[PDB]
């Protein structure tokens, strides 16, 4: 857990969210595995 964790995350607020936080969360985080499928009511 870095400086950027903590900055990637905080930014995600800015709507920003997917492609930062996710990005960084690859190497944030050893938990990554918390999707769902929502919204893939046909894929
Ligand atoms: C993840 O982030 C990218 C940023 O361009 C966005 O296009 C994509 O829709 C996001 N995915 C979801 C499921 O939020
Ligand atoms: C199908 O795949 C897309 C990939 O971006 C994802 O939004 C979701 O899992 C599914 N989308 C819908 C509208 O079914």
Do not use: E, R
């Amino acid at each position: 857990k870095p400086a950027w964790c903590w900055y990637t995350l905080a930014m995600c607020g800015a709507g920003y969210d997917s492609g930062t936080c996710d990005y960084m969360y690859s190497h944030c985080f050893g938990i990554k595995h918390h999707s769902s499928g929502s919204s893939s009511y046909h894929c």
